[PDB]
Protein backbone atom coordinates (compact mmCIF):
# COMPACT_ATOMS: atom_id res chain seq x y z
CA UNK A 1 0.00 0.00 0.00
CA UNK A 2 1.16 3.50 -0.91
CA UNK A 3 1.50 5.49 2.31
CA UNK A 4 3.35 8.76 3.11
CA UNK A 5 6.49 8.46 5.21
CA UNK A 6 5.99 10.83 8.18
CA UNK A 7 3.79 13.73 7.06
CA UNK A 8 3.66 17.00 9.02
CA UNK A 9 0.36 16.33 10.78
CA UNK A 10 -1.35 13.05 11.68
CA UNK A 11 -5.00 13.95 11.14
CA UNK A 12 -6.52 16.40 8.69
CA UNK A 13 -9.88 17.86 7.65
CA UNK A 14 -12.51 16.26 5.44
CA UNK A 15 -12.43 18.87 2.68
CA UNK A 16 -14.66 19.12 -0.39
CA UNK A 17 -13.63 17.50 -3.69
CA UNK A 18 -14.88 20.16 -6.12
CA UNK A 19 -13.27 21.05 -9.44
CA UNK A 20 -11.48 19.31 -12.31
CA UNK A 21 -8.06 17.62 -12.31
CA UNK A 22 -4.68 18.81 -13.59
CA UNK A 23 -2.63 15.70 -14.40
CA UNK A 24 -4.73 15.18 -17.52
CA UNK A 25 -2.18 14.41 -20.25
CA UNK A 26 -0.42 11.08 -20.77
CA UNK A 27 3.17 12.08 -19.98
CA UNK A 28 5.50 9.14 -19.26
CA UNK A 29 3.78 6.29 -21.06
CA UNK A 30 1.64 6.34 -24.20
CA UNK A 31 -1.69 4.98 -22.94
CA UNK A 32 -3.70 6.03 -19.93
CA UNK A 33 -6.68 5.32 -17.72
CA UNK A 34 -8.26 8.74 -17.25
CA UNK A 35 -10.76 9.00 -14.40
CA UNK A 36 -14.16 10.26 -15.51
CA UNK A 37 -16.04 10.12 -12.21
CA UNK A 38 -15.22 12.14 -9.10
CA UNK A 39 -14.38 10.24 -5.92
CA UNK A 40 -11.66 8.98 -3.59
CA UNK A 41 -9.32 6.01 -3.95
CA UNK A 42 -7.98 4.25 -0.87
CA UNK A 43 -4.42 2.87 -0.80
CA UNK A 44 -5.96 -0.61 -0.92
CA UNK A 45 -7.78 0.04 -4.20
CA UNK A 46 -4.80 1.60 -5.97
CA UNK A 47 -2.61 -1.32 -4.88
CA UNK A 48 -5.25 -3.89 -5.89
CA UNK A 49 -5.80 -2.28 -9.29
CA UNK A 50 -2.06 -2.52 -9.92
CA UNK A 51 -1.53 -6.22 -9.18
CA UNK A 52 -4.36 -7.06 -11.57
CA UNK A 53 -2.76 -4.75 -14.14
CA UNK A 54 0.84 -5.88 -13.72
CA UNK A 55 -0.43 -9.38 -14.50
CA UNK A 56 -2.08 -8.74 -17.87
CA UNK A 57 1.01 -7.13 -19.43
CA UNK A 58 3.51 -9.51 -17.79
CA UNK A 59 7.01 -8.70 -16.53
CA UNK A 60 7.42 -6.57 -19.66
CA UNK A 61 6.24 -2.98 -19.97
CA UNK A 62 6.38 -0.16 -17.43
CA UNK A 63 3.41 1.13 -15.44
CA UNK A 64 3.19 4.60 -13.92
CA UNK A 65 0.99 5.43 -10.95
CA UNK A 66 0.03 9.08 -11.32
CA UNK A 67 -1.79 9.07 -7.98
CA UNK A 68 -0.62 9.04 -4.39
CA UNK A 69 -2.99 9.07 -1.35
CA UNK A 70 -1.42 11.59 1.06
CA UNK A 71 -4.77 12.19 2.80
CA UNK A 72 -5.58 10.40 6.09
CA UNK A 73 -9.18 9.29 6.69
CA UNK A 74 -10.40 8.75 10.26
CA UNK A 75 -12.69 5.97 11.49
CA UNK A 76 -14.34 5.87 14.91
CA UNK A 77 -14.43 2.47 16.67
CA UNK A 78 -17.78 0.68 16.98
CA UNK A 79 -20.05 1.39 19.96
CA UNK A 80 -18.32 4.73 20.59
CA UNK A 81 -20.56 7.76 21.15
CA UNK A 82 -20.03 10.92 19.11
CA UNK A 83 -17.67 13.59 20.36
CA UNK A 84 -14.58 12.90 22.47
CA UNK A 85 -12.26 13.98 19.66
CA UNK A 86 -11.13 13.02 16.17
CA UNK A 87 -11.03 9.28 15.49
CA UNK A 88 -8.07 7.14 14.52
CA UNK A 89 -6.46 7.27 11.07
CA UNK A 90 -7.20 3.92 9.43
CA UNK A 91 -6.49 4.35 5.72
CA UNK A 92 -5.26 6.87 3.16
CA UNK A 93 -7.34 8.08 0.25
CA UNK A 94 -6.46 10.07 -2.85
CA UNK A 95 -8.99 12.71 -3.91
CA UNK A 96 -9.64 11.94 -7.57
CA UNK A 97 -11.14 14.66 -9.74
CA UNK A 98 -12.54 14.22 -13.28
CA UNK A 99 -9.77 14.13 -15.86
CA UNK A 100 -7.10 12.77 -13.54
CA UNK A 101 -4.94 10.19 -15.31
CA UNK A 102 -4.75 7.32 -12.82
CA UNK A 103 -2.29 5.06 -14.63
CA UNK A 104 0.02 5.17 -17.63
CA UNK A 105 1.49 2.22 -19.50
CA UNK A 106 4.31 1.88 -22.00
CA UNK A 107 6.13 -0.96 -23.72
CA UNK A 108 3.08 -2.93 -24.83
CA UNK A 109 0.64 -3.25 -27.76
CA UNK A 110 -2.32 -0.85 -27.68
CA UNK A 111 -4.90 -3.66 -27.79
CA UNK A 112 -3.12 -5.40 -24.91
CA UNK A 113 -3.12 -2.15 -22.92
CA UNK A 114 -6.77 -1.72 -23.87
CA UNK A 115 -7.50 -5.04 -22.14
CA UNK A 116 -5.16 -4.46 -19.20
CA UNK A 117 -6.97 -1.25 -18.27
CA UNK A 118 -10.24 -3.18 -18.38
CA UNK A 119 -9.01 -5.41 -15.55
CA UNK A 120 -7.95 -2.43 -13.42
CA UNK A 121 -11.14 -0.44 -14.03
CA UNK A 122 -13.12 -3.25 -12.39
CA UNK A 123 -11.09 -2.85 -9.19
CA UNK A 124 -11.71 0.91 -8.88
CA UNK A 125 -14.95 2.67 -7.81
CA UNK A 126 -14.76 5.65 -10.18
CA UNK A 127 -15.79 5.40 -13.83
CA UNK A 128 -12.74 5.52 -16.08
CA UNK A 129 -11.88 5.77 -19.76
CA UNK A 130 -9.05 4.83 -22.10
CA UNK A 131 -7.04 7.75 -23.49
CA UNK A 132 -4.08 7.98 -25.87
CA UNK A 133 -0.99 10.19 -25.61
CA UNK A 134 -1.51 13.00 -28.10
CA UNK A 135 1.10 14.89 -30.11
CA UNK A 136 1.13 18.16 -28.15
Amino acid sequence: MLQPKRTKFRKMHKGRNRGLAQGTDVSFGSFGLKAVGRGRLTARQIEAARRAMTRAVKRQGKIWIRVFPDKPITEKPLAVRMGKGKGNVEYWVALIQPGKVLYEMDGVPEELAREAFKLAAAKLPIKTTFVTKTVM
Binding site: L20, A21, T24, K34, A35, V36, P98, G99, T129, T134, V135, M136
Partner: protein
Protein backbone atom coordinates in the same frame (compact mmCIF):
# COMPACT_ATOMS: atom_id res chain seq x y z
CA UNK B 1 -5.18 20.04 -47.71
CA UNK B 2 -5.24 21.24 -44.11
CA UNK B 3 -7.59 24.14 -44.79
CA UNK B 4 -9.96 24.99 -41.96
CA UNK B 5 -13.07 27.11 -42.36
CA UNK B 6 -13.46 29.74 -39.67
CA UNK B 7 -15.47 32.84 -38.80
CA UNK B 8 -15.17 36.06 -36.82
CA UNK B 9 -16.55 36.15 -33.30
CA UNK B 10 -18.63 39.08 -32.08
CA UNK B 11 -19.09 37.93 -28.47
CA UNK B 12 -16.62 36.45 -25.99
CA UNK B 13 -16.05 35.47 -22.38
CA UNK B 14 -17.25 32.58 -20.21
CA UNK B 15 -20.93 33.04 -21.01
CA UNK B 16 -20.60 33.70 -24.74
CA UNK B 17 -17.87 31.09 -25.20
CA UNK B 18 -19.75 28.13 -23.74
CA UNK B 19 -22.89 29.27 -25.53
CA UNK B 20 -21.48 28.37 -28.94
CA UNK B 21 -19.35 25.47 -27.70
CA UNK B 22 -22.71 23.81 -27.06
CA UNK B 23 -23.28 24.07 -30.83
CA UNK B 24 -20.26 22.17 -32.19
CA UNK B 25 -18.36 25.45 -32.53
CA UNK B 26 -15.32 25.99 -30.35
CA UNK B 27 -13.47 29.33 -30.39
CA UNK B 28 -9.81 29.96 -31.13
CA UNK B 29 -7.49 32.82 -31.95
CA UNK B 30 -4.77 33.75 -34.40
CA UNK B 31 -1.98 35.77 -32.83
CA UNK B 32 1.65 36.45 -33.58
CA UNK B 33 3.50 38.65 -36.04
CA UNK B 34 2.52 42.31 -36.15
CA UNK B 35 -1.26 42.18 -36.58
CA UNK B 36 -3.90 42.31 -33.87
CA UNK B 37 -4.93 38.91 -32.43
CA UNK B 38 -7.96 37.76 -34.44
CA UNK B 39 -10.89 36.18 -32.57
CA UNK B 40 -11.28 33.09 -34.71
CA UNK B 41 -14.41 31.02 -34.26
CA UNK B 42 -14.41 27.64 -36.00
CA UNK B 43 -16.32 24.37 -36.29
CA UNK B 44 -15.47 21.40 -34.07
CA UNK B 45 -16.35 18.28 -36.08
CA UNK B 46 -13.98 19.04 -38.95
CA UNK B 47 -11.03 20.07 -36.78
CA UNK B 48 -11.57 17.13 -34.41
CA UNK B 49 -10.83 14.85 -37.36
CA UNK B 50 -7.81 16.81 -38.63
CA UNK B 51 -5.99 16.62 -35.29
CA UNK B 52 -6.21 12.82 -35.39
CA UNK B 53 -3.37 12.97 -37.92
CA UNK B 54 -0.07 13.93 -36.27
CA UNK B 55 0.87 16.13 -39.25
CA UNK B 56 -1.69 18.63 -37.95
CA UNK B 57 0.71 19.90 -35.28
CA UNK B 58 3.70 20.05 -37.63
CA UNK B 59 2.50 21.12 -41.07
CA UNK B 60 1.71 24.79 -41.68
CA UNK B 61 -2.07 25.14 -41.87
CA UNK B 62 -4.31 27.53 -43.77
CA UNK B 63 -7.27 29.33 -42.21
CA UNK B 64 -9.77 30.88 -44.62
CA UNK B 65 -11.61 33.40 -42.44
CA UNK B 66 -13.98 35.68 -44.36
CA UNK B 67 -12.12 34.90 -47.58
CA UNK B 68 -8.76 36.03 -46.22
CA UNK B 69 -6.29 33.17 -46.04
CA UNK B 70 -4.00 32.99 -43.01
CA UNK B 71 -1.23 30.39 -42.82
CA UNK B 72 -0.57 29.29 -39.25
CA UNK B 73 0.82 26.66 -36.89
CA UNK B 74 -1.36 25.22 -34.11
CA UNK B 75 0.41 26.51 -30.99
CA UNK B 76 -1.64 25.61 -27.93
CA UNK B 77 -4.80 23.55 -27.60
CA UNK B 78 -7.23 22.94 -24.75
CA UNK B 79 -8.96 19.59 -24.74
CA UNK B 80 -12.00 18.86 -22.61
CA UNK B 81 -10.60 17.33 -19.36
CA UNK B 82 -12.38 13.98 -19.75
CA UNK B 83 -14.33 14.05 -23.00
CA UNK B 84 -12.79 13.53 -26.46
CA UNK B 85 -13.35 17.08 -27.74
CA UNK B 86 -11.74 20.54 -27.84
CA UNK B 87 -12.29 23.93 -26.22
CA UNK B 88 -9.89 26.44 -27.80
CA UNK B 89 -6.81 26.54 -30.03
CA UNK B 90 -3.98 29.04 -30.21
CA UNK B 91 -2.81 29.57 -33.78
CA UNK B 92 0.54 31.29 -34.14
CA UNK B 93 0.33 33.23 -37.40
CA UNK B 94 3.41 31.81 -39.13
Amino acid sequence: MFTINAEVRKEQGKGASRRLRAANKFPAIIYGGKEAPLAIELDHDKVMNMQAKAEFYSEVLTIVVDGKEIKVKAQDVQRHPYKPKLQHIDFVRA
